[PDB]
PDB file of all heavy atoms in Angstrom:
ATOM      1  N   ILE A   1      -2.676  10.005  -4.449  1.00  0.00           N
ATOM      2  CA  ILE A   1      -1.728   9.949  -5.564  1.00  0.00           C
ATOM      3  C   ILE A   1      -2.251   8.925  -6.612  1.00  0.00           C
ATOM      4  O   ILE A   1      -2.749   7.869  -6.235  1.00  0.00           O
ATOM      5  CB  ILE A   1      -0.287   9.508  -5.153  1.00  0.00           C
ATOM      6  CG1 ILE A   1       0.301  10.520  -4.185  1.00  0.00           C
ATOM      7  CG2 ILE A   1       0.634   9.312  -6.349  1.00  0.00           C
ATOM      8  CD1 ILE A   1       1.575  10.043  -3.414  1.00  0.00           C
ATOM      9  N   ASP A   2      -2.257   9.305  -7.918  1.00  0.00           N
ATOM     10  CA  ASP A   2      -2.792   8.319  -8.883  1.00  0.00           C
ATOM     11  C   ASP A   2      -1.816   7.184  -9.252  1.00  0.00           C
ATOM     12  O   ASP A   2      -0.637   7.218  -8.894  1.00  0.00           O
ATOM     13  CB  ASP A   2      -3.259   9.128 -10.175  1.00  0.00           C
ATOM     14  CG  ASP A   2      -2.015   9.810 -10.852  1.00  0.00           C
ATOM     15  OD1 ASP A   2      -1.183  10.403 -10.127  1.00  0.00           O
ATOM     16  OD2 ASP A   2      -1.996   9.763 -12.113  1.00  0.00           O
ATOM     17  N   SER A   3      -2.428   6.209  -9.997  1.00  0.00           N
ATOM     18  CA  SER A   3      -1.689   5.119 -10.630  1.00  0.00           C
ATOM     19  C   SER A   3      -0.870   4.238  -9.634  1.00  0.00           C
ATOM     20  O   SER A   3      -0.958   4.344  -8.411  1.00  0.00           O
ATOM     21  CB  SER A   3      -0.721   5.659 -11.671  1.00  0.00           C
ATOM     22  OG  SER A   3      -1.309   5.708 -12.989  1.00  0.00           O
ATOM     23  N   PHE A   4      -0.087   3.349 -10.247  1.00  0.00           N
ATOM     24  CA  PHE A   4       0.871   2.483  -9.649  1.00  0.00           C
ATOM     25  C   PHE A   4       1.731   3.221  -8.641  1.00  0.00           C
ATOM     26  O   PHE A   4       2.010   2.712  -7.514  1.00  0.00           O
ATOM     27  CB  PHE A   4       1.743   1.834 -10.679  1.00  0.00           C
ATOM     28  CG  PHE A   4       2.618   0.752 -10.163  1.00  0.00           C
ATOM     29  CD1 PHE A   4       2.108  -0.503  -9.802  1.00  0.00           C
ATOM     30  CD2 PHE A   4       3.984   0.976  -9.924  1.00  0.00           C
ATOM     31  CE1 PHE A   4       2.934  -1.491  -9.297  1.00  0.00           C
ATOM     32  CE2 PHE A   4       4.824   0.033  -9.429  1.00  0.00           C
ATOM     33  CZ  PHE A   4       4.304  -1.250  -9.088  1.00  0.00           C
ATOM     34  N   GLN A   5       2.177   4.432  -8.947  1.00  0.00           N
ATOM     35  CA  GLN A   5       3.022   5.237  -8.070  1.00  0.00           C
ATOM     36  C   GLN A   5       2.458   5.426  -6.643  1.00  0.00           C
ATOM     37  O   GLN A   5       3.226   5.664  -5.724  1.00  0.00           O
ATOM     38  CB  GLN A   5       3.272   6.594  -8.749  1.00  0.00           C
ATOM     39  CG  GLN A   5       4.163   7.555  -8.005  1.00  0.00           C
ATOM     40  CD  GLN A   5       5.607   7.061  -7.833  1.00  0.00           C
ATOM     41  OE1 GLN A   5       6.280   6.604  -8.773  1.00  0.00           O
ATOM     42  NE2 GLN A   5       6.142   7.218  -6.647  1.00  0.00           N
ATOM     43  N   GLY A   6       1.126   5.373  -6.476  1.00  0.00           N
ATOM     44  CA  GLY A   6       0.594   5.472  -5.119  1.00  0.00           C
ATOM     45  C   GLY A   6       0.926   4.371  -4.119  1.00  0.00           C
ATOM     46  O   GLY A   6       0.654   4.506  -2.887  1.00  0.00           O
ATOM     47  N   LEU A   7       1.505   3.298  -4.645  1.00  0.00           N
ATOM     48  CA  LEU A   7       1.821   2.055  -3.893  1.00  0.00           C
ATOM     49  C   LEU A   7       2.917   2.320  -2.869  1.00  0.00           C
ATOM     50  O   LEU A   7       2.882   1.814  -1.747  1.00  0.00           O
ATOM     51  CB  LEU A   7       2.210   0.927  -4.873  1.00  0.00           C
ATOM     52  CG  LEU A   7       2.816  -0.369  -4.334  1.00  0.00           C
ATOM     53  CD1 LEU A   7       1.891  -1.067  -3.369  1.00  0.00           C
ATOM     54  CD2 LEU A   7       3.151  -1.285  -5.504  1.00  0.00           C
ATOM     55  N   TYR A   8       3.944   3.128  -3.264  1.00  0.00           N
ATOM     56  CA  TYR A   8       5.089   3.425  -2.395  1.00  0.00           C
ATOM     57  C   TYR A   8       4.679   4.122  -1.130  1.00  0.00           C
ATOM     58  O   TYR A   8       5.025   3.603  -0.015  1.00  0.00           O
ATOM     59  CB  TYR A   8       6.097   4.257  -3.128  1.00  0.00           C
ATOM     60  CG  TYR A   8       6.647   3.674  -4.438  1.00  0.00           C
ATOM     61  CD1 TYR A   8       6.170   4.089  -5.707  1.00  0.00           C
ATOM     62  CD2 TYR A   8       7.653   2.670  -4.398  1.00  0.00           C
ATOM     63  CE1 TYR A   8       6.705   3.551  -6.883  1.00  0.00           C
ATOM     64  CE2 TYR A   8       8.147   2.037  -5.595  1.00  0.00           C
ATOM     65  CZ  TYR A   8       7.651   2.533  -6.834  1.00  0.00           C
ATOM     66  OH  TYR A   8       8.131   2.025  -7.991  1.00  0.00           O
ATOM     67  N   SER A   9       3.939   5.221  -1.189  1.00  0.00           N
ATOM     68  CA  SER A   9       3.507   5.891   0.042  1.00  0.00           C
ATOM     69  C   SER A   9       2.523   5.036   0.850  1.00  0.00           C
ATOM     70  O   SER A   9       2.548   5.048   2.073  1.00  0.00           O
ATOM     71  CB  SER A   9       2.868   7.288  -0.253  1.00  0.00           C
ATOM     72  OG  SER A   9       1.879   7.251  -1.219  1.00  0.00           O
ATOM     73  N   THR A  10       1.711   4.279   0.133  1.00  0.00           N
ATOM     74  CA  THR A  10       0.757   3.388   0.831  1.00  0.00           C
ATOM     75  C   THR A  10       1.567   2.335   1.601  1.00  0.00           C
ATOM     76  O   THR A  10       1.315   2.066   2.767  1.00  0.00           O
ATOM     77  CB  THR A  10      -0.176   2.664  -0.185  1.00  0.00           C
ATOM     78  OG1 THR A  10      -0.789   3.617  -1.049  1.00  0.00           O
ATOM     79  CG2 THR A  10      -1.225   1.857   0.553  1.00  0.00           C
ATOM     80  N   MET A  11       2.557   1.752   0.933  1.00  0.00           N
ATOM     81  CA  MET A  11       3.497   0.811   1.536  1.00  0.00           C
ATOM     82  C   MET A  11       4.095   1.370   2.828  1.00  0.00           C
ATOM     83  O   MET A  11       3.961   0.725   3.849  1.00  0.00           O
ATOM     84  CB  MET A  11       4.599   0.512   0.477  1.00  0.00           C
ATOM     85  CG  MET A  11       5.277  -0.840   0.718  1.00  0.00           C
ATOM     86  SD  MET A  11       6.806  -0.968  -0.300  1.00  0.00           S
ATOM     87  CE  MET A  11       8.034  -0.253   0.814  1.00  0.00           C
ATOM     88  N   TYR A  12       4.750   2.549   2.725  1.00  0.00           N
ATOM     89  CA  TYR A  12       5.316   3.167   3.915  1.00  0.00           C
ATOM     90  C   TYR A  12       4.365   3.623   4.991  1.00  0.00           C
ATOM     91  O   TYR A  12       4.698   3.569   6.167  1.00  0.00           O
ATOM     92  CB  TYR A  12       6.281   4.307   3.536  1.00  0.00           C
ATOM     93  CG  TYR A  12       7.636   3.725   3.086  1.00  0.00           C
ATOM     94  CD1 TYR A  12       7.833   3.501   1.689  1.00  0.00           C
ATOM     95  CD2 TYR A  12       8.626   3.374   3.946  1.00  0.00           C
ATOM     96  CE1 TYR A  12       9.047   2.968   1.260  1.00  0.00           C
ATOM     97  CE2 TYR A  12       9.860   2.862   3.509  1.00  0.00           C
ATOM     98  CZ  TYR A  12      10.052   2.654   2.170  1.00  0.00           C
ATOM     99  OH  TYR A  12      11.186   2.112   1.653  1.00  0.00           O
ATOM    100  N   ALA A  13       3.147   4.090   4.615  1.00  0.00           N
ATOM    101  CA  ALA A  13       2.111   4.443   5.558  1.00  0.00           C
ATOM    102  C   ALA A  13       1.748   3.231   6.458  1.00  0.00           C
ATOM    103  O   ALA A  13       1.507   3.351   7.639  1.00  0.00           O
ATOM    104  CB  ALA A  13       0.862   4.985   4.867  1.00  0.00           C
ATOM    105  N   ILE A  14       1.713   2.035   5.821  1.00  0.00           N
ATOM    106  CA  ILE A  14       1.375   0.811   6.540  1.00  0.00           C
ATOM    107  C   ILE A  14       2.532   0.456   7.481  1.00  0.00           C
ATOM    108  O   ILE A  14       2.340   0.192   8.633  1.00  0.00           O
ATOM    109  CB  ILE A  14       0.997  -0.335   5.571  1.00  0.00           C
ATOM    110  CG1 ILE A  14      -0.413  -0.194   5.005  1.00  0.00           C
ATOM    111  CG2 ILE A  14       1.020  -1.724   6.349  1.00  0.00           C
ATOM    112  CD1 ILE A  14      -0.653  -0.745   3.570  1.00  0.00           C
ATOM    113  N   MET A  15       3.739   0.490   6.903  1.00  0.00           N
ATOM    114  CA  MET A  15       4.948   0.235   7.673  1.00  0.00           C
ATOM    115  C   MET A  15       5.044   1.015   8.968  1.00  0.00           C
ATOM    116  O   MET A  15       5.600   0.513   9.928  1.00  0.00           O
ATOM    117  CB  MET A  15       6.186   0.381   6.808  1.00  0.00           C
ATOM    118  CG  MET A  15       6.532  -0.789   5.902  1.00  0.00           C
ATOM    119  SD  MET A  15       7.500  -0.327   4.478  1.00  0.00           S
ATOM    120  CE  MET A  15       7.756  -1.929   3.751  1.00  0.00           C
ATOM    121  N   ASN A  16       4.480   2.219   8.918  1.00  0.00           N
ATOM    122  CA  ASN A  16       4.523   3.127  10.040  1.00  0.00           C
ATOM    123  C   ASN A  16       3.328   3.127  10.971  1.00  0.00           C
ATOM    124  O   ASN A  16       3.211   4.003  11.812  1.00  0.00           O
ATOM    125  CB  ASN A  16       4.908   4.529   9.646  1.00  0.00           C
ATOM    126  CG  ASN A  16       6.380   4.773   9.463  1.00  0.00           C
ATOM    127  OD1 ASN A  16       7.096   4.811  10.468  1.00  0.00           O
ATOM    128  ND2 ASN A  16       6.870   4.793   8.240  1.00  0.00           N
ATOM    129  N   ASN A  17       2.507   2.135  10.752  1.00  0.00           N
ATOM    130  CA  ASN A  17       1.347   1.852  11.630  1.00  0.00           C
ATOM    131  C   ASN A  17       0.225   2.877  11.604  1.00  0.00           C
ATOM    132  O   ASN A  17      -0.519   3.100  12.600  1.00  0.00           O
ATOM    133  CB  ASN A  17       1.802   1.384  13.015  1.00  0.00           C
ATOM    134  CG  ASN A  17       2.584   0.109  12.967  1.00  0.00           C
ATOM    135  OD1 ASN A  17       3.669   0.049  12.393  1.00  0.00           O
ATOM    136  ND2 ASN A  17       2.052  -1.034  13.542  1.00  0.00           N
ATOM    137  N   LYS A  18       0.094   3.580  10.516  1.00  0.00           N
ATOM    138  CA  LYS A  18      -0.888   4.666  10.343  1.00  0.00           C
ATOM    139  C   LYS A  18      -2.201   4.174   9.862  1.00  0.00           C
ATOM    140  O   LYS A  18      -2.333   3.057   9.350  1.00  0.00           O
ATOM    141  CB  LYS A  18      -0.272   5.701   9.365  1.00  0.00           C
ATOM    142  CG  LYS A  18       1.050   6.314   9.834  1.00  0.00           C
ATOM    143  CD  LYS A  18       0.992   6.830  11.270  1.00  0.00           C
ATOM    144  CE  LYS A  18       2.294   7.592  11.723  1.00  0.00           C
ATOM    145  NZ  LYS A  18       2.266   7.921  13.183  1.00  0.00           N
ATOM    146  N   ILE A  19      -3.255   4.980  10.070  1.00  0.00           N
ATOM    147  CA  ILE A  19      -4.504   4.818   9.415  1.00  0.00           C
ATOM    148  C   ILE A  19      -4.321   5.307   7.971  1.00  0.00           C
ATOM    149  O   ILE A  19      -3.891   6.463   7.817  1.00  0.00           O
ATOM    150  CB  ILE A  19      -5.596   5.607  10.147  1.00  0.00           C
ATOM    151  CG1 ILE A  19      -5.625   5.206  11.644  1.00  0.00           C
ATOM    152  CG2 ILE A  19      -6.925   5.484   9.434  1.00  0.00           C
ATOM    153  CD1 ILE A  19      -6.638   4.087  12.061  1.00  0.00           C
ATOM    154  N   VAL A  20      -4.628   4.493   7.027  1.00  0.00           N
ATOM    155  CA  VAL A  20      -4.416   4.830   5.622  1.00  0.00           C
ATOM    156  C   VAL A  20      -5.753   4.900   4.884  1.00  0.00           C
ATOM    157  O   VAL A  20      -6.393   3.910   4.568  1.00  0.00           O
ATOM    158  CB  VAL A  20      -3.536   3.754   4.922  1.00  0.00           C
ATOM    159  CG1 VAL A  20      -3.160   4.155   3.490  1.00  0.00           C
ATOM    160  CG2 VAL A  20      -2.301   3.450   5.735  1.00  0.00           C
ATOM    161  N   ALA A  21      -6.150   6.139   4.578  1.00  0.00           N
ATOM    162  CA  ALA A  21      -7.408   6.427   3.912  1.00  0.00           C
ATOM    163  C   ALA A  21      -7.077   6.328   2.437  1.00  0.00           C
ATOM    164  O   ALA A  21      -6.573   7.297   1.873  1.00  0.00           O
ATOM    165  CB  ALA A  21      -7.886   7.815   4.278  1.00  0.00           C
ATOM    166  N   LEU A  22      -7.384   5.183   1.785  1.00  0.00           N
ATOM    167  CA  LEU A  22      -6.824   4.915   0.503  1.00  0.00           C
ATOM    168  C   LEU A  22      -7.801   5.077  -0.657  1.00  0.00           C
ATOM    169  O   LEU A  22      -8.776   4.308  -0.737  1.00  0.00           O
ATOM    170  CB  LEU A  22      -6.202   3.502   0.523  1.00  0.00           C
ATOM    171  CG  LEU A  22      -5.571   2.936  -0.702  1.00  0.00           C
ATOM    172  CD1 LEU A  22      -4.318   3.749  -1.059  1.00  0.00           C
ATOM    173  CD2 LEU A  22      -5.227   1.476  -0.496  1.00  0.00           C
ATOM    174  N   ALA A  23      -7.574   5.960  -1.569  1.00  0.00           N
ATOM    175  CA  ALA A  23      -8.398   6.174  -2.746  1.00  0.00           C
ATOM    176  C   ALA A  23      -7.796   5.529  -3.946  1.00  0.00           C
ATOM    177  O   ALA A  23      -8.491   5.025  -4.832  1.00  0.00           O
ATOM    178  CB  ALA A  23      -8.643   7.646  -3.044  1.00  0.00           C
ATOM    179  N   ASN A  24      -6.440   5.552  -3.974  1.00  0.00           N
ATOM    180  CA  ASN A  24      -5.629   4.893  -5.000  1.00  0.00           C
ATOM    181  C   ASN A  24      -6.039   3.387  -5.059  1.00  0.00           C
ATOM    182  O   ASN A  24      -5.833   2.685  -4.112  1.00  0.00           O
ATOM    183  CB  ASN A  24      -4.171   4.975  -4.638  1.00  0.00           C
ATOM    184  CG  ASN A  24      -3.278   4.417  -5.760  1.00  0.00           C
ATOM    185  OD1 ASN A  24      -2.708   3.373  -5.585  1.00  0.00           O
ATOM    186  ND2 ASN A  24      -3.207   5.097  -6.901  1.00  0.00           N
ATOM    187  N   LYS A  25      -6.571   2.948  -6.157  1.00  0.00           N
ATOM    188  CA  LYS A  25      -7.039   1.613  -6.193  1.00  0.00           C
ATOM    189  C   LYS A  25      -5.988   0.698  -6.851  1.00  0.00           C
ATOM    190  O   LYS A  25      -5.993  -0.470  -6.615  1.00  0.00           O
ATOM    191  CB  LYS A  25      -8.449   1.518  -6.869  1.00  0.00           C
ATOM    192  CG  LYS A  25      -8.437   1.714  -8.341  1.00  0.00           C
ATOM    193  CD  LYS A  25      -9.824   2.070  -8.875  1.00  0.00           C
ATOM    194  CE  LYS A  25     -10.261   3.484  -8.461  1.00  0.00           C
ATOM    195  NZ  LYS A  25     -11.648   3.625  -8.904  1.00  0.00           N
ATOM    196  N   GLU A  26      -5.147   1.287  -7.648  1.00  0.00           N
ATOM    197  CA  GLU A  26      -4.122   0.585  -8.451  1.00  0.00           C
ATOM    198  C   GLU A  26      -3.172  -0.102  -7.518  1.00  0.00           C
ATOM    199  O   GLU A  26      -2.669  -1.206  -7.883  1.00  0.00           O
ATOM    200  CB  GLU A  26      -3.356   1.577  -9.320  1.00  0.00           C
ATOM    201  CG  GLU A  26      -4.121   2.101 -10.511  1.00  0.00           C
ATOM    202  CD  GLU A  26      -4.840   3.486 -10.215  1.00  0.00           C
ATOM    203  OE1 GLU A  26      -5.040   3.917  -9.086  1.00  0.00           O
ATOM    204  OE2 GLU A  26      -5.220   4.118 -11.243  1.00  0.00           O
ATOM    205  N   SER A  27      -2.828   0.507  -6.398  1.00  0.00           N
ATOM    206  CA  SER A  27      -1.975  -0.131  -5.422  1.00  0.00           C
ATOM    207  C   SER A  27      -2.590  -1.417  -4.954  1.00  0.00           C
ATOM    208  O   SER A  27      -1.836  -2.429  -4.823  1.00  0.00           O
ATOM    209  CB  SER A  27      -1.709   0.816  -4.271  1.00  0.00           C
ATOM    210  OG  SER A  27      -2.891   1.093  -3.566  1.00  0.00           O
ATOM    211  N   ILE A  28      -3.890  -1.525  -4.688  1.00  0.00           N
ATOM    212  CA  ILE A  28      -4.516  -2.749  -4.220  1.00  0.00           C
ATOM    213  C   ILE A  28      -4.578  -3.794  -5.332  1.00  0.00           C
ATOM    214  O   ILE A  28      -4.507  -5.002  -5.080  1.00  0.00           O
ATOM    215  CB  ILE A  28      -5.951  -2.484  -3.713  1.00  0.00           C
ATOM    216  CG1 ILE A  28      -5.967  -1.336  -2.744  1.00  0.00           C
ATOM    217  CG2 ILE A  28      -6.571  -3.750  -3.101  1.00  0.00           C
ATOM    218  CD1 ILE A  28      -7.184  -1.345  -1.775  1.00  0.00           C
ATOM    219  N   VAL A  29      -4.704  -3.363  -6.565  1.00  0.00           N
ATOM    220  CA  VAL A  29      -4.885  -4.317  -7.648  1.00  0.00           C
ATOM    221  C   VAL A  29      -3.487  -4.983  -7.876  1.00  0.00           C
ATOM    222  O   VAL A  29      -3.450  -6.197  -8.005  1.00  0.00           O
ATOM    223  CB  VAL A  29      -5.406  -3.619  -8.934  1.00  0.00           C
ATOM    224  CG1 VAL A  29      -5.323  -4.529 -10.177  1.00  0.00           C
ATOM    225  CG2 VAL A  29      -6.891  -3.200  -8.662  1.00  0.00           C
ATOM    226  N   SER A  30      -2.481  -4.166  -7.977  1.00  0.00           N
ATOM    227  CA  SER A  30      -1.141  -4.666  -8.330  1.00  0.00           C
ATOM    228  C   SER A  30      -0.431  -5.452  -7.212  1.00  0.00           C
ATOM    229  O   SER A  30       0.443  -6.236  -7.446  1.00  0.00           O
ATOM    230  CB  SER A  30      -0.241  -3.411  -8.659  1.00  0.00           C
ATOM    231  OG  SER A  30      -0.714  -2.748  -9.809  1.00  0.00           O
ATOM    232  N   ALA A  31      -0.886  -5.178  -5.966  1.00  0.00           N
ATOM    233  CA  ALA A  31      -0.116  -5.630  -4.795  1.00  0.00           C
ATOM    234  C   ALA A  31      -0.941  -6.054  -3.615  1.00  0.00           C
ATOM    235  O   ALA A  31      -0.491  -5.915  -2.471  1.00  0.00           O
ATOM    236  CB  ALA A  31       0.817  -4.486  -4.427  1.00  0.00           C
ATOM    237  N   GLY A  32      -2.185  -6.602  -3.820  1.00  0.00           N
ATOM    238  CA  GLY A  32      -3.026  -6.941  -2.769  1.00  0.00           C
ATOM    239  C   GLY A  32      -2.463  -7.940  -1.725  1.00  0.00           C
ATOM    240  O   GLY A  32      -2.616  -7.763  -0.524  1.00  0.00           O
ATOM    241  N   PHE A  33      -1.864  -8.996  -2.220  1.00  0.00           N
ATOM    242  CA  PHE A  33      -1.311 -10.001  -1.280  1.00  0.00           C
ATOM    243  C   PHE A  33      -0.073  -9.462  -0.575  1.00  0.00           C
ATOM    244  O   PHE A  33       0.114  -9.728   0.604  1.00  0.00           O
ATOM    245  CB  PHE A  33      -1.022 -11.304  -2.047  1.00  0.00           C
ATOM    246  CG  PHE A  33      -0.384 -11.151  -3.423  1.00  0.00           C
ATOM    247  CD1 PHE A  33       0.396 -12.147  -3.982  1.00  0.00           C
ATOM    248  CD2 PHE A  33      -0.640  -9.957  -4.160  1.00  0.00           C
ATOM    249  CE1 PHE A  33       0.950 -11.970  -5.269  1.00  0.00           C
ATOM    250  CE2 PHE A  33      -0.075  -9.783  -5.430  1.00  0.00           C
ATOM    251  CZ  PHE A  33       0.731 -10.732  -5.968  1.00  0.00           C
ATOM    252  N   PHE A  34       0.732  -8.665  -1.311  1.00  0.00           N
ATOM    253  CA  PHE A  34       1.824  -7.904  -0.624  1.00  0.00           C
ATOM    254  C   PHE A  34       1.309  -6.994   0.459  1.00  0.00           C
ATOM    255  O   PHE A  34       1.883  -6.951   1.526  1.00  0.00           O
ATOM    256  CB  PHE A  34       2.640  -7.133  -1.670  1.00  0.00           C
ATOM    257  CG  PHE A  34       3.668  -6.209  -1.072  1.00  0.00           C
ATOM    258  CD1 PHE A  34       5.010  -6.577  -1.007  1.00  0.00           C
ATOM    259  CD2 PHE A  34       3.282  -4.956  -0.557  1.00  0.00           C
ATOM    260  CE1 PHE A  34       5.987  -5.706  -0.408  1.00  0.00           C
ATOM    261  CE2 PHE A  34       4.272  -4.096   0.030  1.00  0.00           C
ATOM    262  CZ  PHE A  34       5.598  -4.478   0.068  1.00  0.00           C
ATOM    263  N   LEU A  35       0.170  -6.295   0.185  1.00  0.00           N
ATOM    264  CA  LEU A  35      -0.371  -5.441   1.185  1.00  0.00           C
ATOM    265  C   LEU A  35      -0.992  -6.238   2.312  1.00  0.00           C
ATOM    266  O   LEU A  35      -0.882  -5.852   3.476  1.00  0.00           O
ATOM    267  CB  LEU A  35      -1.419  -4.478   0.584  1.00  0.00           C
ATOM    268  CG  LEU A  35      -0.727  -3.351  -0.297  1.00  0.00           C
ATOM    269  CD1 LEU A  35      -1.722  -2.493  -1.074  1.00  0.00           C
ATOM    270  CD2 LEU A  35       0.221  -2.514   0.540  1.00  0.00           C
ATOM    271  N   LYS A  36      -1.596  -7.388   2.021  1.00  0.00           N
ATOM    272  CA  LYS A  36      -2.150  -8.221   3.049  1.00  0.00           C
ATOM    273  C   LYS A  36      -1.020  -8.707   3.969  1.00  0.00           C
ATOM    274  O   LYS A  36      -1.013  -8.457   5.180  1.00  0.00           O
ATOM    275  CB  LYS A  36      -2.884  -9.458   2.427  1.00  0.00           C
ATOM    276  CG  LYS A  36      -3.586 -10.321   3.431  1.00  0.00           C
ATOM    277  CD  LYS A  36      -4.145 -11.621   2.783  1.00  0.00           C
ATOM    278  CE  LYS A  36      -5.313 -11.368   1.889  1.00  0.00           C
ATOM    279  NZ  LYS A  36      -4.855 -10.827   0.586  1.00  0.00           N
ATOM    280  N   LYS A  37       0.025  -9.324   3.391  1.00  0.00           N
ATOM    281  CA  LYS A  37       1.182  -9.772   4.118  1.00  0.00           C
ATOM    282  C   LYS A  37       1.652  -8.668   5.028  1.00  0.00           C
ATOM    283  O   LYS A  37       1.893  -8.850   6.227  1.00  0.00           O
ATOM    284  CB  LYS A  37       2.302 -10.188   3.142  1.00  0.00           C
ATOM    285  CG  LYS A  37       3.604 -10.576   3.781  1.00  0.00           C
ATOM    286  CD  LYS A  37       4.846 -10.501   2.872  1.00  0.00           C
ATOM    287  CE  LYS A  37       4.722 -11.435   1.620  1.00  0.00           C
ATOM    288  NZ  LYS A  37       4.300 -12.869   2.025  1.00  0.00           N
ATOM    289  N   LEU A  38       1.707  -7.448   4.492  1.00  0.00           N
ATOM    290  CA  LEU A  38       2.243  -6.265   5.264  1.00  0.00           C
ATOM    291  C   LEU A  38       1.311  -5.778   6.327  1.00  0.00           C
ATOM    292  O   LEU A  38       1.758  -5.389   7.406  1.00  0.00           O
ATOM    293  CB  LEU A  38       2.512  -5.161   4.246  1.00  0.00           C
ATOM    294  CG  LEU A  38       3.468  -4.086   4.682  1.00  0.00           C
ATOM    295  CD1 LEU A  38       4.881  -4.644   4.709  1.00  0.00           C
ATOM    296  CD2 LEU A  38       3.367  -2.971   3.682  1.00  0.00           C
ATOM    297  N   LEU A  39      -0.017  -5.883   6.087  1.00  0.00           N
ATOM    298  CA  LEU A  39      -0.988  -5.528   7.164  1.00  0.00           C
ATOM    299  C   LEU A  39      -0.961  -6.528   8.250  1.00  0.00           C
ATOM    300  O   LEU A  39      -1.454  -6.213   9.397  1.00  0.00           O
ATOM    301  CB  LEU A  39      -2.365  -5.353   6.540  1.00  0.00           C
ATOM    302  CG  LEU A  39      -2.557  -3.984   5.815  1.00  0.00           C
ATOM    303  CD1 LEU A  39      -3.709  -4.131   4.784  1.00  0.00           C
ATOM    304  CD2 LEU A  39      -2.812  -2.805   6.784  1.00  0.00           C
ATOM    305  N   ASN A  40      -0.577  -7.745   7.975  1.00  0.00           N
ATOM    306  CA  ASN A  40      -0.474  -8.812   8.958  1.00  0.00           C
ATOM    307  C   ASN A  40       0.676  -8.599   9.982  1.00  0.00           C
ATOM    308  O   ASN A  40       0.477  -8.738  11.167  1.00  0.00           O
ATOM    309  CB  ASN A  40      -0.377 -10.178   8.305  1.00  0.00           C
ATOM    310  CG  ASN A  40      -1.739 -10.787   7.983  1.00  0.00           C
ATOM    311  OD1 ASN A  40      -2.722 -10.500   8.700  1.00  0.00           O
ATOM    312  ND2 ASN A  40      -1.807 -11.621   6.936  1.00  0.00           N
ATOM    313  N   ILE A  41       1.844  -8.255   9.462  1.00  0.00           N
ATOM    314  CA  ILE A  41       2.941  -7.830  10.281  1.00  0.00           C
ATOM    315  C   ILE A  41       2.597  -6.618  11.228  1.00  0.00           C
ATOM    316  O   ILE A  41       2.790  -6.676  12.429  1.00  0.00           O
ATOM    317  CB  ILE A  41       4.187  -7.438   9.368  1.00  0.00           C
ATOM    318  CG1 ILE A  41       4.759  -8.691   8.669  1.00  0.00           C
ATOM    319  CG2 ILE A  41       5.306  -6.715  10.145  1.00  0.00           C
ATOM    320  CD1 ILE A  41       5.757  -8.351   7.589  1.00  0.00           C
TER     321      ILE A  41
END
C-alpha cells in the first residue's frame, strides 16, 4: 500500500506477530520509533 496510509496495516501486522515484508517506506519515515517500540513488545 502506498503513502502514509500503509502505516495502519503495517502497525496491525506487527501487533499480530507476523512476518512483515515491507515495501512502504513512508510508514518507517513517519513512525520509526513508534515501530521500534512496537517491535520491542
Side-chain angles (χ1 to χ4, degrees):
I1 297 166
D2 62 320
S3 268
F4 188 76
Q5 182 65 48
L7 169 59
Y8 302 102
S9 53
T10 308
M11 204 191 88
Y12 283 93
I14 284 149
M15 277 157 177
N16 275 286
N17 297 65
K18 301 309 187 188
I19 304 265
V20 187
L22 180 66
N24 185 253
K25 70 199 74 187
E26 289 93 344
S27 64
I28 310 202
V29 169
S30 295
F33 41 156
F34 173 100
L35 288 173
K36 185 190 287 79
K37 177 200 299 312
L38 201 71
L39 282 156
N40 274 330
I41 293 169

